[PDB]
Amino acid sequence: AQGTLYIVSAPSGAGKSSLIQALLKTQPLYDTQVSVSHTTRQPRPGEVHGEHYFFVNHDEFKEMISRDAFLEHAEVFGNYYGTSREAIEQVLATGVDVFLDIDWQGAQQIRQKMPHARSIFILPPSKIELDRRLRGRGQDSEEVIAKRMAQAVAEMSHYAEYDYLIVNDDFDTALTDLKTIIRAERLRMSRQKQRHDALISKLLA
Amino acid sequence: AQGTLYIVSAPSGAGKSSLIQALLKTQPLYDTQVSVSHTTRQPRPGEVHGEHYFFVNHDEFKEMISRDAFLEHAEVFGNYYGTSREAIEQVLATGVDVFLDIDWQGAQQIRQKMPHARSIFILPPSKIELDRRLRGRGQDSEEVIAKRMAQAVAEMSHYAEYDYLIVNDDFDTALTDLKTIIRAERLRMSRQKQRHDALISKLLA
Amino acid sequence: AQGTLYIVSAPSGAGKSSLIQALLKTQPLYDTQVSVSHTTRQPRPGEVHGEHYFFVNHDEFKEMISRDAFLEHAEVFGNYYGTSREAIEQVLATGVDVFLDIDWQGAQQIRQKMPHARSIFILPPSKIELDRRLRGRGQDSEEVIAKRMAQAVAEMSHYAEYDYLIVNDDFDTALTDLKTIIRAERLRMSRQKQRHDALISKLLA
Amino acid sequence: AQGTLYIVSAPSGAGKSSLIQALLKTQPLYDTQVSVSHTTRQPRPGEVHGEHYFFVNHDEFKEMISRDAFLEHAEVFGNYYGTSREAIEQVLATGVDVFLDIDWQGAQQIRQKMPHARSIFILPPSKIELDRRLRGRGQDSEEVIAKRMAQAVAEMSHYAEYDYLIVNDDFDTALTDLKTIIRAERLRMSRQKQRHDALISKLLA
Amino acid sequence: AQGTLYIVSAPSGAGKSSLIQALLKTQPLYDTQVSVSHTTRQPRPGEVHGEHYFFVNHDEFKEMISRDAFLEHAEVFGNYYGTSREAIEQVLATGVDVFLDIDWQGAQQIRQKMPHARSIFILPPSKIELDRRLRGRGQDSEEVIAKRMAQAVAEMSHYAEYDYLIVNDDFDTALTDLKTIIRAERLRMSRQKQRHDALISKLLA
Amino acid sequence: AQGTLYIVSAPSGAGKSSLIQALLKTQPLYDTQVSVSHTTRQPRPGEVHGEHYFFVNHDEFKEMISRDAFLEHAEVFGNYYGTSREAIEQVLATGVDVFLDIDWQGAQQIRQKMPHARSIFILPPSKIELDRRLRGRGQDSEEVIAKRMAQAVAEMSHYAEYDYLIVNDDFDTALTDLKTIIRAERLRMSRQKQRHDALISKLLA
């Protein structure tokens, strides 16, 4: 009973990390999980090793690439990120659906290796709103913000490669759209044929 | 642009009828409609012509087959039923999603002509429960009930042909399942790219 | 197996009427129905025979009492009302939960004959609010209003006899309360053991 | 104003710990709490003393039994567990409803000492699903899993002693069933007579 | 005490009509009603006198203007429409919130006479979508559609006059938005102080 | 794009801290935040500096007052509390709506400096319930409780200065009332004119 891989991408300031965390709190670990990526970037305050990321040195990441540790890996704004194959295969084979919060470059690598995976792209409801979300608390220089928005513009040009699109205007609407996609996918005949492997056998008698 | 054609089929005793009506009350005529089939069966008490069905004589339906007026037609439960082509094509072109409540024979003909149609099959939660619903008020003979149940079993044989499976155990749940499918499909990239065209242009500088 | 008999009573001005209709629209005829009482009162405008009530003459209702046709009967607000036994027993045996919208006199007679019946009493949120609802469009005389309010107070005296109390302040809340009771009862072990019989056998090797 | 004790039992792999935690996050501490049991078992990673359990040595547990510290205690798969009487009585007398996540042996002891307590049993939706939930991440030997399933089979044979049954097929449905039971129980006339001690006094005037 | 007067205006193609009906089905006649306007336009098929509109002749409506029977009146889409004063004042005095589905001309006259009236404007999600809804079944000429769209644009010019803006993209969302406004207003201090008068007295010793 | 300040006050035992925390978990930080106050009171177990409060010595608080650090400050039951101006102005100017959990004295100071802020007062559903909530786990002396209730009585006399009133009888109802207020306020024409700054421009063409 193999589970389904879900790809979730978005520019910074579309609210993707908060949409996925809120989805996860409604779901037991036997239905849905998130993958823990590897990264070279510094742990932020509040972040714990093995929960959000496995944090590693540049040289250790390199080692991992060279021994084919990764289902996908990429550089994103000055650091490396990747999804280790072993833990993914292991969780999917227990029937769990697994969320991959990754950029468009990782999404592409996943699509070719796992053609069944479903990908969701999240957009902000406008440029004005994107800019206000991107600015955060509002203490970065104009320059640092132009570079941010430019990285976001790059991410967004890749949206058409995804199977679903969520416009995250209003958080609760968008959360509901995300739950709706996963729920609809579980109503697919292949999935249902199984988990319901005969009630159906009992129906056709 | 084009709305999506939905096919919904079910044995009797699966609550499919009330599920579709309930869904329509929450949905504007510009989003979602049901197709008005032609048939030779008699109107039920309190059932208006042109709203549930176009009711015609045996002789009239046979001449409609000759004029090639139907996208599908079939014989179901001792009467003839057909889906007039002109109205489907006309409602779909205005962007409305159109539901076809038709049997498995009909669904096959539509699949061949309209291959992006999506199909929903609806099952009862058990055989005993199927029997309890078919029996209804329990005033019918054992002989009539026997014929309804064999027809139901025969209908259920063809489930594996459909894209989606809903197990209608609890009505509200099954209603949320039908609403869920419709909503997820509207979140697909092909339709969202259309609906949010202006937004996407702005966002990509 | 057997459906559950529900009794619902309330003074007028407690919104009990619309609560029951609203509940029924969300619920199939094979899950939940309302009992059709006989009465001597006139039909209201736009009120059909056999659907809300079986409307009979004073002389006809008196002969129904003699034939022992009622599970309960009583005099309410200057007219006679009764619950025909045959249809209750017949709907209940098909597994349908049946609601009896009857007064306190009726509820006592049913309690004695049918001791697993469950009863719901419905109260207004205050006396002032009760008065505001009773007054309605405010076109009635102070004398008629005076008689409606004494009847309401008399009805409310008998609340402590019922299994459940709903305070109907906010309609949607009170609707969720009525849906909630019905749903919890269906979760009781006696009914769930029946509904999931096949599952339980499998589970226990 | 004494609160209600709720008993929640299930085999491992019916998702009970996750159903109760999610219920609790919707409820303030003046309405609903969980009891903190005593156990001899080792704290898992993430577990904190006094939150999930009071962790104690074998000898300390023994001391507690001998001085009648426990409303119930039992051995469950190679460790001891129990509910201390003092903290329970103290919380219930402040009107809080208290959840006891305990096995069937503890449930029995509670039933005799507190006959008002309501018990809920949770089942998995099938054996296949139970087995997949039981297997977790999927790294235990076949042997260790047969023993797990055998402990689960034992738990499940005791389900008929409970007042309610939840089949935990779909987490959100099952969570809603749990909230529905507590909510229905609060609509009971005894409870309502109190918390609403006169609005009612004001109604009967 | 007094209910609140609501004004709702919208171009056609904003789904305002079905939004108001849908809202009313969830709401008792003692909480919320729609005003019955007089008009000279013909009844639509299946549209009853005194329930949607009081339908009168041109000559009758002109004499109603002379008797000062209207709180507002105006000419809309080639016919005359008016809000009879007596019924508004009479329903409002019984504590009912009354909705006026009227155009911008009407809303101005009501604002001047009734300055605590609250007003809701409803917009379509885009021009293309507005066009798609106006076109409807697509059987009208390009000339008629042209006149409907100029009327819609003219109506939308006056939006900035209203207290509240609802963008009706997704029906259920827009329905929740209309329910939300009504509910928040009932939470204002002036109305809550009235509704919970007895409670507040007790609470303040 | 300036955000809206929300004031939330209540006596102890109306459940205000739990209502606000639950609201916040549904909202991303770019829509809604809570302010972190300064206080001289001791950190409770579980409390962390900079999350719930900035904890400071009596002398440091004094320093802050003397250099005009505070938008509002006050003494509440033997300790000082205040909201620093800088962090507030900074967050509001990024378009975030900010919740201020403060007493009636702070509310007043905020009202004069920021006349756009919206204030919500929460009441317990009765004195009996207030007293039971105030008593907590139930281990304080009668005397300590009379003083508690007396501080609560003082808070409650100031309720009429607030724009909204929530009666927190049932947690989920009250949470929904709180979400409804914020949501309604976002439907106001001033707010909507902006975030929707032309779709509208595109509508009037």
Ligand SMILES: Nc1nc2c(ncn2[C@@H]2O[C@H](COP(=O)(O)OP(=O)(O)O)[C@@H](O)[C@H]2O)c(=O)[nH]1
């Ligand atoms: N290819 C790939 N991208 C990743 C992976 N993990 C995170 N990212 C991307 O890294 C980007 C920034 O991540 P992060 O430092 O956590 O900031 P944030 O997620 O926007 O708050 C996001 O677009 C992620 O999609 C990964 O394992 N593989």
Ligand SMILES: Nc1nc2c(ncn2[C@@H]2O[C@H](COP(=O)(O)OP(=O)(O)O)[C@@H](O)[C@H]2O)c(=O)[nH]1
């Ligand atoms: N193929 C075909 N079947 C139809 C059509 N309309 C209705 N049916 C089927 O014939 C059966 C109709 O039963 P009906 O008289 O409406 O009673 P119902 O089952 O409660 O709807 C159902 O299975 C429908 O799916 C049609 O247009 N074409």
Ligand SMILES: Nc1nc2c(ncn2[C@@H]2O[C@H](COP(=O)(O)OP(=O)(O)O)[C@@H](O)[C@H]2O)c(=O)[nH]1
């Ligand atoms: N005991 C008895 N009372 C009934 C029966 N049917 C209706 N009633 C009661 O008589 C009253 C009927 O009022 P009705 O004419 O229907 O106006 P309503 O109050 O809005 O329903 C209500 O209190 C009902 O409970 C019945 O079958 N038996």
Ligand SMILES: Nc1nc2c(ncn2[C@@H]2O[C@H](COP(=O)(O)OP(=O)(O)O)[C@@H](O)[C@H]2O)c(=O)[nH]1
């Ligand atoms: N009798 C009794 N059983 C308990 C008590 N606390 C926990 N248990 C049972 O111990 C079993 C396993 O508990 P645990 O080690 O926490 O694993 P888990 O709850 O399945 O994740 C469950 O069936 C509980 O019902 C208790 O205080 N008394």
Ligand SMILES: Nc1nc2c(ncn2[C@@H]2O[C@H](COP(=O)(O)OP(=O)(O)O)[C@@H](O)[C@H]2O)c(=O)[nH]1
């Ligand atoms: N001012 C004024 N306008 C009204 C009144 N009643 C309806 N209208 C407006 O006239 C138009 C009526 O259109 P109608 O014939 O009902 O078709 P509809 O647009 O689907 O409701 C709408 O814009 C209404 O707002 C009224 O009493 N006074």
Ligand SMILES: Nc1nc2c(ncn2[C@@H]2O[C@H](COP(=O)(O)OP(=O)(O)O)[C@@H](O)[C@H]2O)c(=O)[nH]1
């Ligand atoms: N004026 C003002 N009051 C505050 C501030 N922060 C907290 N309070 C008030 O202090 C009172 C007690 O706070 P606390 O010690 O946290 O107890 P609790 O909030 O009831 O659990 C509450 O009424 C708050 O409204 C503040 O920054 N300014």
Ligand SMILES: Nc1nc2c(ncn2[C@@H]2O[C@H](CO)[C@@H](O)[C@H]2O)c(=O)[nH]1
């Ligand atoms: N406008 C705004 N966005 C914020 C603030 N704090 C965090 N964010 C955004 O919230 C998201 C983090 O979940 C990012 O898009 C941040 O930039 C704030 O104070 N204002």
Ligand SMILES: Nc1nc2c(ncn2[C@@H]2O[C@H](CO)[C@@H](O)[C@H]2O)c(=O)[nH]1
């Ligand atoms: N069990 C049962 N099913 C019914 C009753 N009335 C209608 N039905 C069923 O409800 C469905 C129509 O809503 C059909 O499947 C009918 O057979 C009844 O009294 N009992």
Ligand SMILES: Nc1nc2c(ncn2[C@@H]2O[C@H](CO)[C@@H](O)[C@H]2O)c(=O)[nH]1
């Ligand atoms: N306050 C008020 N109650 C009404 C009105 N019309 C009907 N009702 C009440 O609404 C209920 C019927 O739905 C009854 O309790 C009626 O008295 C009205 O205009 N105002």
Ligand SMILES: Nc1nc2c(ncn2[C@@H]2O[C@H](CO)[C@@H](O)[C@H]2O)c(=O)[nH]1
């Ligand atoms: N199938 C599956 N169940 C898991 C996994 N991780 C945890 N669980 C289950 O989730 C529950 C813990 O809440 C237990 O029933 C675990 O066995 C996993 O990766 N796969």
Ligand SMILES: Nc1nc2c(ncn2[C@@H]2O[C@H](CO)[C@@H](O)[C@H]2O)c(=O)[nH]1
């Ligand atoms: N696109 C579309 N709109 C429709 C159709 N039928 C009715 N409407 C629209 O739906 C609304 C009435 O519910 C109006 O705005 C109508 O123009 C249809 O078939 N297609």
Ligand SMILES: Nc1nc2c(ncn2[C@@H]2O[C@H](CO)[C@@H](O)[C@H]2O)c(=O)[nH]1
């Ligand atoms: N009745 C009651 N209230 C409690 C208990 N524990 C905490 N609270 C209340 O819950 C609130 C804290 O969120 C305060 O009003 C506390 O007094 C308890 O055991 N019983």
Ligand SMILES: [K+]
């Ligand atoms: K990641």
Ligand SMILES: [K+]
């Ligand atoms: K059909």
Ligand SMILES: [K+]
């Ligand atoms: K009745």
Ligand SMILES: [K+]
């Ligand atoms: K426990």
